[PDB]
């Protein structure tokens, strides 16, 4: 009785947010982007096939130098590749083979991993000993670790399966702040290019935008009907696309605070495992788990291309910082560098 | 070639890394990956007591020159849909069922008894899309406590239609047939049912005999003989 009348406020507040949708109901993204020149038919070919894992790859991350790559598979190894050659720069044996995420530092000196072991292990690459050692074990989560992303050598945002995210400190080993408010298990996250905000998505079909210094949710986005498991920012930073299990991608805007465009097709079921943007955000690369990635037009909602070529489902995906190539790693033992 | 000495030594290092990865994969392919699943109160830790925080516990053990890795994942308490596909490719699933909890209920969630929850979990993991062809080593623990409890309380508390007496053997066969009939994939999957006793080197003997059979049958499927 005491809470229910609060619900009488609260859903009404949501209706006010819906009334805020009437503040931004003048037009859609398709109406503004009419009579524009399309990107056209895209035939980008695989160039490298990074063949050194022996189980299914769950994550990859490019380097900021756009040549190094990192990958984590469901065997106990995490391999750092040269992409120009096909050279394994490193191979790190892991304490637990159940890793679902990995990250590559912008400085390039550290890598991260995590998964069912609830620990974001940080490994120091550049060292005087010559071999990669465990720099810092970041324990403290209770759910399964789902995403990790670096800010610098000391800050890292980890989203786990305990419906919370956390920003940590490498030297202290403890959480600087905890982001709370999702009701389902948190699956993905993405930082802005100016790293002031990051938007993260969970299994409750809600994408929440957080500030790294405030520690609280700024904006909340809804419109999916299944577990959101992929989020990538626009390179401008004022918008972000997401992908979930309903085989639809959605482009939300931070300023409009609503969904702009929906990317879907009639013959596509078996939804998205990973999304990314190209340079200038014109193409949306979505890795669907009917074994292939699709190139959608971010302004025309048209399927420009198909990146089929993986024998199993494209778990992980990523575009280089200069946009030279896109890597897709799948649930066979293989990464592929499409260009 | 157009490598020069630095990139030639770099591809030599990558070849050494390839060799170490191949040796590590051959060492890891000698292990048998098993998954412990259950309601939690089934006494599967007692199974850990019979074979010999983090969300996954690995119970490495050996029996007759064969090494088993047993993955207890029931302490995760998360949504099982988003991380059970990590375990697609285990050799078998060791589902543990408490026989003595046929009449015991849990009133915290929805007041229903624990055996219907265990049967719901068995229907969820047997008919999963990832465990289409991974056989189940079903274990029925606490048989003596179940016998001492069915000496007083009959089986009709759990099952509304049980046309049998209070004999331990007939009720155990009825429970085994009820758990086996949740298999909708009987052509591509078998269920190995055992009653957990206090005799040493017999539950692990059942696991070893079940795992050799599923390895033989999976090899006969993979080589085209089946």
């Amino acid at each position: 009785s005491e809470l229910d009348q609060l619900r009488q406020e609260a859903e009404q507040l949501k209706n006010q947010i819906r009334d805020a949708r009437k503040a931004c109901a003048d037009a859609t993204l398709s109406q503004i982007t009419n009579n524009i020149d399309p990107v056209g038919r895209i035939q980008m070919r695989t160039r490298r096939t990074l063949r050194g894992h022996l189980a299914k790859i769950y994550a990859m991350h490019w380097g900021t130098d756009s040549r190094l790559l990192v990958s984590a598979s469901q065997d106990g190894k995490l391999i750092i590749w040269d992409s120009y050659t096909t050279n394994k720069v490193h191979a790190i044996p892991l304490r637990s083979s159940w890793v679902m995420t990995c990250a590559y530092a912008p400085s390039g000196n550290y890598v991260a991993c995590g998964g069912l072991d609830n620990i974001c292990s940080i490994y120091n690459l550049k060292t005087r000993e010559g071999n990669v050692r465990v720099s810092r074990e970041l324990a403290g989560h209770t759910g399964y670790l789902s995403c990790c992303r670096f800010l610098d050598d000391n800050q890292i945002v980890t989203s786990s399966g305990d419906t919370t995210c956390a920003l940590w400190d490498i030297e202290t080993g403890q959480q600087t702040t905890t982001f709370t408010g999702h009701t389902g298990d948190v699956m993905s996250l993405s930082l802005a290019p100016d790293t002031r905000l990051f938007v993260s998505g969970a299994c409750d079909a809600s994408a929440k935008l957080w500030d790294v210094r405030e520690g609280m949710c700024r904006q909340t986005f809804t419109g999916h009907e299944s577990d959101i498991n992929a989020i990538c920012f626009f390179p401008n930073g004022n918008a972000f696309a997401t992908g979930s299990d309903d085989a639809t991608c959605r482009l939300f805007d931070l300023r409009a605070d609503q969904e702009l465009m929906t990317y879907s097709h009639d013959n596509i079921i078996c939804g998205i495992t990973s999304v990314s943007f190209s340079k200038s955000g014109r193409l949306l690369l979505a890795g669907y788990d009917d074994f292939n990635c699709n190139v959608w037009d971010a302004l025309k909602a048209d399927r420009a291309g198909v990146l089929a070529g993986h024998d199993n489902r494209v778990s992980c995906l990523g575009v280089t910082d200069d946009g030279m190539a896109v890597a897709t790693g799948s649930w066979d033992s293989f990464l592929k560098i499409w260009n | 070639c157009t490598l020069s000495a630095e990139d030639k030594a770099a591809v030599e290092r990558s070849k050494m890394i390839d060799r170490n990865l191949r040796e590590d994969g051959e060492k890891a392919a000698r292990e048998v990956k098993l998954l412990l699943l259950g309601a939690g109160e089934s006494g599967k830790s007692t199974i850990v007591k019979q074979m010999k925080t983090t969300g996954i516990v690995e119970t490495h053990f050996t029996f007759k020159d064969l090494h088993f890795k047993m993955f207890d994942v029931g302490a995760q308490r998360s949504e099982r849909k988003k991380w059970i596909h990590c375990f697609e490719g285990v050799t078998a699933i060791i589902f543990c069922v408490a026989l003595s909890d046929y009449d015991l209920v849990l009133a915290e969630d929805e007041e229903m008894n624990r055996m219907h929850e265990s049967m719901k979990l068995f229907d969820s993991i047997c008919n999963n899309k990832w465990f289409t062809d991974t056989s189940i080593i079903l274990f029925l623990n606490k048989k003596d406590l179940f016998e001492e409890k069915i000496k007083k309380s009959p089986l009709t508390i759990c099952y509304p239609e049980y046309a049998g007496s209070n004999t331990y053997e007939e009720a155990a066969a009825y429970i085994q047939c009820q758990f086996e009939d949740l298999n909708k994939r009987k052509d591509t999957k078998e269920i190995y049912t055992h009653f957990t006793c206090s005799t040493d080197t017999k539950n692990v003997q059942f696991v070893f005999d079940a795992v050799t059979d599923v390895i033989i049958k999976n090899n006969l499927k993979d080589c085209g003989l089946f």
């Epitope: 190094l68 390039g108 005087r128 | 020069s4 000495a5 030599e12």
Partner: single-chain antibody, 235 residues
Framework: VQLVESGGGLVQPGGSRKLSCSAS????????MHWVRQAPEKGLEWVAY????????YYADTVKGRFTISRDDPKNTLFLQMTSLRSEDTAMYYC??????????????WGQGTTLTVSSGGSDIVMTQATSSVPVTPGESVSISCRSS???????????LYWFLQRPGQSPQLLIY???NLASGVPDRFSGSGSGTAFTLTISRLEAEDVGVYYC?????????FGAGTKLELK
Amino acid sequence: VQLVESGGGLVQPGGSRKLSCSASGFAFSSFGMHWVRQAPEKGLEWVAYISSGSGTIYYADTVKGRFTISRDDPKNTLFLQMTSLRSEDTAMYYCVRSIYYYGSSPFDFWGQGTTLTVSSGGSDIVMTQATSSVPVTPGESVSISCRSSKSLLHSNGNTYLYWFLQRPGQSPQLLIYRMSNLASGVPDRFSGSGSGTAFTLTISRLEAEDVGVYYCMQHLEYPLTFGAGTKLELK
């Protein structure tokens, strides 16, 4: 990270001598090993090289047919079997570790050295240094130029030139690897530049620890040839 040599001393010409370089504090089996000798009042010269896991063994012109280099990875010790020594082998042998991947820093550590003395009885790249002794002053900018007979630029964009500083009484220390990258422990005042065949090493705000001999070494293809040796002296 230690590289301690032993077994050196005075030997007869034509005799046999073995040098054992003990490595500790780092992974020995993942590091390619080199032998660099240095005669008194001379420069550095590469002798022999064995890679990680003994995959590749190289020898120089005066080394092939006479020497034998091997490693013991469980023992973490580098060996050098020398047969039929001559008067030109009287030099200070340095045990050098090296690693090779993308972004690595090869020749990043040198041993303390051992003394070998012998009593009395080619389509290569030649490193050219204009002046072997430049009198410098502290607080100014110092420019050191080295040349090569062949262009060190390759198809991958890497220009394989190195800079080594050998302080008196101390092992040589790597300063700049691949002409533009600062090594570990080297301060930010050191810089390098070059274009294909012409090279420029710039030292700004020279201090008391920058005194020593400067060497330029190529790494385009074996055999590895060091420079003549430029020594910077105060006043």
